[PDB]
Write an enzyme that holds these catalytic residues in place. Structure first.
Site, PDB file in Angstrom:
ATOM      1  N   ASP A   1      -1.560   1.650  10.465  1.00 51.68           N
ATOM      2  CA  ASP A   1      -1.049   0.645   9.530  1.00 51.68           C
ATOM      3  C   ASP A   1       0.433   0.280   9.711  1.00 51.68           C
ATOM      4  OD1 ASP A   1       0.189   2.870   8.418  1.00 51.68           O
ATOM      5  OD2 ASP A   1      -1.218   2.973   6.656  1.00 51.68           O
TER       6      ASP A   1
ATOM      7  N   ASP B   1      -4.119   1.704   3.489  1.00 56.33           N
ATOM      8  CA  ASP B   1      -3.644   3.018   3.926  1.00 56.33           C
ATOM      9  C   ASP B   1      -4.630   3.513   4.965  1.00 56.33           C
ATOM     10  OD1 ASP B   1      -1.981   5.282   3.789  1.00 56.33           O
ATOM     11  OD2 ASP B   1      -3.328   6.237   2.295  1.00 56.33           O
ATOM     12  N   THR B   2      -4.129   3.704   6.187  1.00 54.63           N
ATOM     13  CA  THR B   2      -4.883   4.389   7.228  1.00 54.63           C
ATOM     14  C   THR B   2      -4.571   5.869   7.204  1.00 54.63           C
ATOM     15  OG1 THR B   2      -3.159   3.774   8.905  1.00 54.63           O
ATOM     16  CG2 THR B   2      -5.091   2.368   8.767  1.00 54.63           C
TER      17      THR B   2
ATOM     18  N   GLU C   1      -3.249   9.335   8.668  1.00 56.76           N
ATOM     19  CA  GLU C   1      -2.242   9.642   9.648  1.00 56.76           C
ATOM     20  C   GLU C   1      -2.911  10.150  10.919  1.00 56.76           C
ATOM     21  OE1 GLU C   1       1.164   9.095   8.880  1.00 56.76           O
ATOM     22  OE2 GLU C   1       0.633   8.270   6.972  1.00 56.76           O
TER      23      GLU C   1
HETATM   24  C1  LIG Z   1       2.265  -0.219   1.720  1.00 53.11           C
HETATM   25  C2  LIG Z   1       3.522   0.048   0.926  1.00 53.11           C
HETATM   26  C3  LIG Z   1       4.086   1.280   1.029  1.00 53.11           C
HETATM   27  N1  LIG Z   1       5.239   1.544   0.322  1.00 53.11           N
HETATM   28  C4  LIG Z   1       5.877   2.915   0.364  1.00 53.11           C
HETATM   29  C5  LIG Z   1       5.182   3.767  -0.723  1.00 53.11           C
HETATM   30  C6  LIG Z   1       5.068   5.121  -0.067  1.00 53.11           C
HETATM   31  O1  LIG Z   1       6.260   5.919  -0.448  1.00 53.11           O
HETATM   32  P1  LIG Z   1       6.340   7.517  -0.104  1.00 53.11           P
HETATM   33  O2  LIG Z   1       6.746   7.607   1.378  1.00 53.11           O
HETATM   34  O3  LIG Z   1       7.468   7.937  -1.062  1.00 53.11           O
HETATM   35  O4  LIG Z   1       4.989   8.116  -0.309  1.00 53.11           O
HETATM   36  C7  LIG Z   1       5.088   4.825   1.424  1.00 53.11           C
HETATM   37  C8  LIG Z   1       3.725   5.077   2.041  1.00 53.11           C
HETATM   38  O5  LIG Z   1       3.713   4.582   3.432  1.00 53.11           O
HETATM   39  P2  LIG Z   1       2.910   5.313   4.470  1.00 53.11           P
HETATM   40  O6  LIG Z   1       1.442   5.289   4.034  1.00 53.11           O
HETATM   41  O7  LIG Z   1       3.241   4.537   5.712  1.00 53.11           O
HETATM   42  O8  LIG Z   1       3.336   6.775   4.620  1.00 53.11           O
HETATM   43  O9  LIG Z   1       5.561   3.512   1.551  1.00 53.11           O
HETATM   44  C9  LIG Z   1       5.838   0.574  -0.479  1.00 53.11           C
HETATM   45  O10 LIG Z   1       6.867   0.869  -1.167  1.00 53.11           O
HETATM   46  N2  LIG Z   1       5.319  -0.642  -0.610  1.00 53.11           N
HETATM   47  C10 LIG Z   1       4.135  -0.937   0.054  1.00 53.11           C
HETATM   48  O11 LIG Z   1       3.670  -2.081  -0.111  1.00 53.11           O
HETATM   49 CA   LIG Z   2      -0.740   5.716   6.248  1.00 54.43          CA
END
Ligand SMILES: Cc1cn([C@H]2C[C@H](OP(=O)(O)O)[C@@H](COP(=O)(O)O)O2)c(=O)[nH]c1=O
Ligand SMILES: [Ca+2]
Length: 129
Positions: free
Chosen positions: A15, A34-35, A37
């Site tokens: 993603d 969400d993919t 990891e």
């Molecule tokens: C998809 C998306 C993720 N995010 C943030 C929330 C998550 O915070 P945290 O890192 O604090 O969990 C993180 C998850 O991305 P990843 O799934 O790439 O890890 O990215 C946003 O703020 N807005 C969004 O639209």
């Molecule tokens: Ca992810």
């Protein structure tokens, strides 16, 4: 919403992708999905799916939603299209992503994606298997 040009710099994972946008390198995180990891089940399959879709495309485009265009890590937040096909939707349709991170005001394509998820789950595909 409007599609804007970008070119592939490098696949990253299911993603996230590195694209050149307005002539600057940036990492994009795909909206509403969400993919797994890479180290998790189906992570390698999701990464491969996005890598193939991006690398095979003649034309990559990004489409911002109405709200935040950057997250707290500086990643761009968009829907991405490969030869007119939405990568976000495709991942969900194949059961390689869940609909997730649906924030108010960046959720234009939520229902489209939830419909794809329901189809993947009916077919028992990948994460739904
Ligand atoms: C998809 C998306 C993720 N995010 C943030 C929330 C998550 O915070 P945290 O890192 O604090 O969990 C993180 C998850 O991305 P990843 O799934 O790439 O890890 O990215 C946003 O703020 N807005 C969004 O639209
Ligand atoms: Ca992810």
């Amino acid at each position: 919403l409007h599609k804007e040009p970008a070119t592939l710099i490098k696949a990253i994972d299911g993603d996230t992708v590195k694209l050149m946008y307005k002539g600057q390198p940036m990492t994009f995180r795909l909206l509403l999905v969400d993919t797994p990891e890479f180290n998790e089940k189906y992570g390698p399959e999701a990464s491969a799916f996005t890598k193939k879709m991006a690398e095979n495309a003649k034309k990559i485009e990004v489409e911002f939603d109405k709200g935040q265009r950057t997250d707290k890590y500086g990643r761009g937040l968009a829907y991405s299209y490969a030869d007119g096909k939405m990568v976000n939707e495709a991942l969900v349709r194949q059961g390689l992503a869940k609909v997730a991170y649906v924030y108010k005001g960046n959720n234009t394509h939520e229902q489209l994606l939830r419909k794809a998820e329901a189809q993947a789950k009916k077919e028992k595909l990948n994460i739904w298997s």
